[PDB]
Design a protein around this nucleic acid. Sequence first.
RNA 1: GAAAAAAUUUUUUUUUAGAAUCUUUUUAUGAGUAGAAAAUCGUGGGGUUUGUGUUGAAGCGAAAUACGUGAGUUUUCGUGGA
RNA 2: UUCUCAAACUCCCAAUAGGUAAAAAGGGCGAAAUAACUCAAUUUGUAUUUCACUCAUAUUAAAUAAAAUAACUCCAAGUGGGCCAUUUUUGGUAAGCAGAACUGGCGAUGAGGGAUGCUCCUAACGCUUGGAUAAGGUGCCUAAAUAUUCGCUCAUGAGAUCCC
RNA 3: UUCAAUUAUUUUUUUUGCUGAGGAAUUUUAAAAUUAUUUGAAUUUUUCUUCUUAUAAUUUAAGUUGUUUCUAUACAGUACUU
Lengths: 180, 155, 97, 66, 223, 186, 125
Amino acid sequence: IDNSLNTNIHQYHIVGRAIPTAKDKNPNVYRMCIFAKNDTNAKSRFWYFMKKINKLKKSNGELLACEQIKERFPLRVKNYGVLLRYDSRTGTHNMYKEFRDTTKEGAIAQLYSEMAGRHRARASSINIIRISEISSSLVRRPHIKQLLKRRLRFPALHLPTLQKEYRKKFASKRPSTYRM
Amino acid sequence: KSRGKRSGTRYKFSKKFRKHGECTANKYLEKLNYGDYVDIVCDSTQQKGMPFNYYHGKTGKIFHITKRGVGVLVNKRVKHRIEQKKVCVRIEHVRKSRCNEDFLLRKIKNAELIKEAKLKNEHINIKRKTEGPKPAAMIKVPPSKIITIEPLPFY
Amino acid sequence: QASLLAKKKPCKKRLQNKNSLTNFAVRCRLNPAYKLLRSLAVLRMRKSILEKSKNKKEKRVQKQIQKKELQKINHDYYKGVAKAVKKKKKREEKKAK
Amino acid sequence: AKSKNHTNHNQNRKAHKNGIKKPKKHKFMSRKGLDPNFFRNQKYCLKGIQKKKKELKLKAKQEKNN
Amino acid sequence: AAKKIKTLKLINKKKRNDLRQRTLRYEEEYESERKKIIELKREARKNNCFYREAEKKVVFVIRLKGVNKLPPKVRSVFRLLRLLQVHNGVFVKVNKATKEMLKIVEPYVTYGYPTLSTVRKLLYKRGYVRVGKVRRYARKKIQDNADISKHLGKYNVHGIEDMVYQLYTCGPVFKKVNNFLWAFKLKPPRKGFKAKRHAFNEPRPGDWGNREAHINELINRMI
Amino acid sequence: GIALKNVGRIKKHGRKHLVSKNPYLRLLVKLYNFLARRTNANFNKIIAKRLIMPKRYRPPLSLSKLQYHMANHPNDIAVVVGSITDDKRLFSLKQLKVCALRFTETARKRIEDAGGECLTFDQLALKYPTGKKCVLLRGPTKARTAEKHFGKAPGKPKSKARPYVRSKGRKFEKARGRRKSRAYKK
Amino acid sequence: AVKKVGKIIKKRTKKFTRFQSNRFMRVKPAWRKPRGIDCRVRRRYKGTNLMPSIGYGSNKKTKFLLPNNKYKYVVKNVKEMEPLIMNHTKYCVQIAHNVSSKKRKQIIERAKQMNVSVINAKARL
RNA sequence: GAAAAAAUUUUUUUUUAGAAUCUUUUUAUGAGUAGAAAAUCGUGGGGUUUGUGUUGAAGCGAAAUACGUGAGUUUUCGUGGA
RNA sequence: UUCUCAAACUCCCAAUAGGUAAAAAGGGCGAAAUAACUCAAUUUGUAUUUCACUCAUAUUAAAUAAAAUAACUCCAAGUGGGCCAUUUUUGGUAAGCAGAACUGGCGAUGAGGGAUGCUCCUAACGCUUGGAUAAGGUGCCUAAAUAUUCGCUCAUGAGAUCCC
RNA sequence: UUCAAUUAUUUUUUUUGCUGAGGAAUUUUAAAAUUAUUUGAAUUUUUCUUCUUAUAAUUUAAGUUGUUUCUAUACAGUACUU
């Protein structure tokens, strides 16, 4: 239960094979990791890739395993690099982008948020090919490179946003945006 | 409308590839007559007792046979009703139907199953399979026999 | 009078639904075993927080050993998953040029 | 101006409204179109079968009745 | 007179004993089967093998679309399916013809695998049965075993737990019991529904089509 | 909104009540409705339905047909849900015990003379409430005058029926459409 | 809304007024449905003017009952009291309009002696 | 075929169904022009029945703790004079 | 060898849509009968018939079915100008143009949404109370968040939701 | 200082909103449930542990009842109906 609120989307290891036949008595086993909102969606995404890659379809295959993946440490930061193929209005484009997070799932959430925000690209039009941990020295993006410096601080960059109780319509004196 | 008899020549009446004058001996000799179901198929050779367009590839019961003619009871939809029509066709046009052959083979096989069960005084069902949902199974998989898939970059 | 058959009975008049999950008598009427199920539940509950507190140590010591042996095996399985992704990533990265 | 040309609209739906009827005469296809000579031979056979039957039926009824 | 009445009470007592006992055997068996699945799966995964668990045999199919503007094949399938009211749910036995029927109506129905606690709970709160005659049905709420002990007495699945058992396992008599049961007309689906259009394998919200185990969550909301 | 055909209604057809105002017939359908409901005998249920049925569509039975039907029955109790009419075409000797809706006076007199019994429906109910060891009979419809008139067109080919025709005169309906020589025939 | 009184629910306040009779003097005030014609108000365009149907009907137990808890029975002669008297609990007397005062007085007095309420006995003095 | 209450075992008060197109009960159902049906309601006359009339009818105007889903019915007050 | 081609060309060739099939008034394997058909062959076949022996069916001859609300017969009504949408589609530069196909609507029917609106979406209606939702929204008009969360965006005519 | 999360089978609890058809002369009866007893078993072993043996009651069975107010100690009033 916890008390925890925001942000959800999960990681699944799915394994499947072609249905056994007289013609082939030892089907090829195919495995993939898939980021999805649930197991049924994860199976469908696996099937879409199985259909695109192989000539296998749900009617001609069998599930060997499907199991949810949990990240090794929830609170230790890693730099995840993700390679995407996405579709524009005209056609197809490739991108490999870098995200600092404690979770691969969080990095995918940032990626979907970026693809939506910077290109107006819909979830349907994205294909994730590999998300993996990248060393600090190796990183291309300057926005991730800046985080990786020796020392970091800010004088508070964010406006207040008090609880509903204290968002009342009238104030007694003029306030300030933030303390110095 | 403006509808003469053989309209749709280039469609239905067009011959099968390299099939000319096929008239060999075995074609004639089938004999199940008054009870039988029979398909009505066009012959490129024979114009003499060729059916009307609608009856092509349709199936129905033989109700009367003559020297080389066959009466066939065929179903036709006429607007709001499907009705039985007495189609006169020739021996070259009639092809023995195979639906009867499925029923017969199943009857024979089931009869053998019944006969086997009866000898043992067994209680068992000779009814057809449903092709039901698959049960549990097992496979042992080494690291060598499992392949990692991923989507493809443009190439 | 002899020939004509015995009187039949009309339908019963409508009653309340009596359809609560907590309508115990109706639930027992409907499912005779439900009392046994309540008893089983009660046997699990009765032991209560003190016995369970004592039990919790016994559980954790015997589950630690079982989990650790099962987990090390499973960690090798997880490593195989990691290894397979890494193997594909490297092979493709080499292949592309 | 012009009157309507093709339209077959609503007719399928009207057919399905009252259901698409099918024949139900079934057994014993009949009369004139039956095979010449062979069916007359059958009539003679049937008449023969009937005569043998009638002879049996008349004798059996008459012997018991009186 | 008194002997017949006495005999009937004795018969009722025998049935109560039998049903209580059957329930206990079922309760152990279902739980044991689930425990064996855990044991099998755990044994295979650790010891480097792949256990393929069975198909789930039944599916609860809930309609979730209005009666206006229906395609004709879809209309026909709905009549056979028996989802004549727009919030009907019903159990269906998974085979090949049933799956293809489900495919034809797919964007207009949600469906999935109904778990054993859910199936009982839904049957308890919303169980009605046809108490009339064939094609003169009368719809009565199930508040005792005697009504269904009449109807399912020949089949020997008389009494509600046995019916629940047939629903759970896809038992030897499924069709008749299902047919005797009313098609469950459900409440609107509380908090967190949304997105009537399309289907659940779009990344955007909308419960329509297959949602597997997650059918139960939806059923719990609309109970 | 439910999808049921005919809005879920069961709609019964044919007679829903007896519409006669005859006191005796109203009393009789009360009686036979009671006898059907209590006994649950099929014989009584048929009688109740036939009593409710249209008086015009209730048939006459011929005495010749009644005797011809009863020939293999050594039990003598005929029941007829219609009127029994006399015969002037044969000797008509052998008596019966017959319950009928209505008797012609000549028929009744002959049956009584012969040593038979002409039995009321109240007497039938009283004596034989289960209908056991009896014979239920119907007179034939036998293509009545309306039936001769109707039945999927007389003017269509391959059909046998009577149209309107006033054919007592000479020059009546015989030509174009009814004649192979003049245009075509039915 | 509606008018509950004990176990007697009466479901209709505000008897209906015939459509357009507010606008036109000629049209009779008493209700008529525009059933005989197309009319675009039988077409149920909301808030235009509500119109009646069977559903508003009284319950089977209370069907014609007065708030007196007694069915009204109209009386124009004294002798008509005599069958009515054994059911005086469930029925109430109404004396007809057209009754001459000597007779009316006699009927009122007799009815009071017969011990049943008479709802217009306090009138025609 | 007996239920309750009031009294002070014994008195009083309320209720006490059998109309078979009727009554009790259950469950399902309710769109609607053209169009078809059924159940009603109202008007003129007649036979039939048993009532209303000059201590005031019909009619009319204003209404009615009124009744009916409704068409309407019934009533009160005022006029009115057959 | 090579480039481009046709829906009025066809080596090859779909999906969708469509047809026949799934046993008891029948079917099996047998005997006997009947003939003026057949065949040397009045038991050679045929067909028919009478006798047998016997085919699953406690539930089932694959599913699924408020499958008899089905059939069938009668008598009579109205109607015979249509129009709208998606997808496929012919003519015409195009058309809220002319003409279709399949289905669903509207017409004859509405409640809620689409500011608004005959056809779009949600959803089809006895009379009421309570509930929980749909389409759809939640700054104010105007009922619900000046919600949360990550982007992007400054416009000397920014931009704002299918049919529109 | 901790003992997660998510499924699985379960068991509750804090406030509280709305509703009350009905009226059981041979089915508001019967069984169930629960309590106090009684006898024999059981098993996780028990202060809501289970069955059945016998006995009584009751309600969670078997569709709201109760208590105290008020109108009012009125005769139509400004309250009440409309």
